[PDB]
Amino acid sequence: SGTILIDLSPDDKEFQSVEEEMQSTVREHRDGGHAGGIFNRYNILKIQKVCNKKLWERYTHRRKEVSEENHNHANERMLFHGSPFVNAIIHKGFDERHAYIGGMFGAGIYFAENSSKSNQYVYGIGGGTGCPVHKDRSCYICHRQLLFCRVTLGKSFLQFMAHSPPGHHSVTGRPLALAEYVIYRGEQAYPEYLITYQIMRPE
Ligand SMILES: CCOc1ccc(-c2nnc([C@H]3C[C@H](NC(=O)c4ccc5cnccc5n4)C3)n2-c2ccccc2F)nc1
Ligand SMILES: [Zn+2]
């Protein structure tokens, strides 16, 4: 593995930006915290820059080729990613071959602009079985990990499917409607930050 993790100081403006974006993008969900638990804040334990030359080259190469297909704009966004595979993604990069064959928008890799949305997928689809220790989707004890990723959306197809529709590079969903984003190529996302956190008990 060529992956290096740069621990960021909490007083670092880079840490604070990722910290603020995580806290500020929390929303009240329609499922009442069934999937991701009950909280309005996080305990931010650690934020690490993910450095991997091979993975960066894979991303920038795809970003250029999506750019030339989409009027010389990549449509690059910073989005959150939750999945039980974070530990794999930071070493191997995103891999569409492991996508959930049955999903709202087919076998793609899902991102959110709301940290609390990505939180719902950390322990599986709809929080799966919860934390491995307590089997609790609302565990305040167990440490969770999100990625904050550079994602190339390109020309995004709006939907309310194996690959992007023709002429398109991604899908934007809006099923309290919140925006999800799907790609069908792992090279269209770079996992830039690894965020280790807990959900905070309110009171
Ligand atoms: C609204 C429908 O609900 C959702 C929400 C999120 C996702 C999703 N998005 N991304 C994923 C993960 C699969 C994909 N896997 C990898 O990138 C990856 C990368 C390297 C891997 C190495 N070894 C084993 C597995 C590996 N997996 C990220 N998943 C995902 C896939 C399977 C199970 C849970 C998931 F969150 N799928 C459906
Ligand atoms: Zn737990």
Q: What is the DSSP string of 33-65?
A: TTTT-S-SSEEEEEEEEEE-HHHHHHHHHHHHH
**Bridge partners (DSSP) listed for residue 112:** 80, 180
Atom of ligand 1 nearest to the CA of 182: 9
Domain total in the chain: 1
- Cβ atoms of 6 and 51 closer than 8 Å: yes
114: Cβ below 6 Å to ligand 1?
no
Residues of each annotated binding site for Zn(2+): 131, 134, 139, 142
| SS3 label, residue 14 | helix
Elucidation technique: X-ray
Cα dihedral sign, 58-121-132-200: positive
Residues with CB under 5 A from ligand 2 (ion): 131, 133-134, 139, 141-142
In the structure encoding, which two tokens stand for residue 186, read together? Answer: 């792992």
In the structure encoding, which two tokens stand for residue 132, read together? Answer: 């491995």
Domain with 145 in it: what CATH number?
Answer: 3.90.228.10
Resolution, given in Å to one decimal, reads: 2.5
Distances (CA, A) of 165 to 17, 143, 168, 182: 34, 37, 5, 12
121: Cβ below 6 Å to ligand 1?
yes
Comparing C-alpha atoms, which of 21, 5, 17 is closest to residue 80? 21
Domain of residue 73 covers 2-203
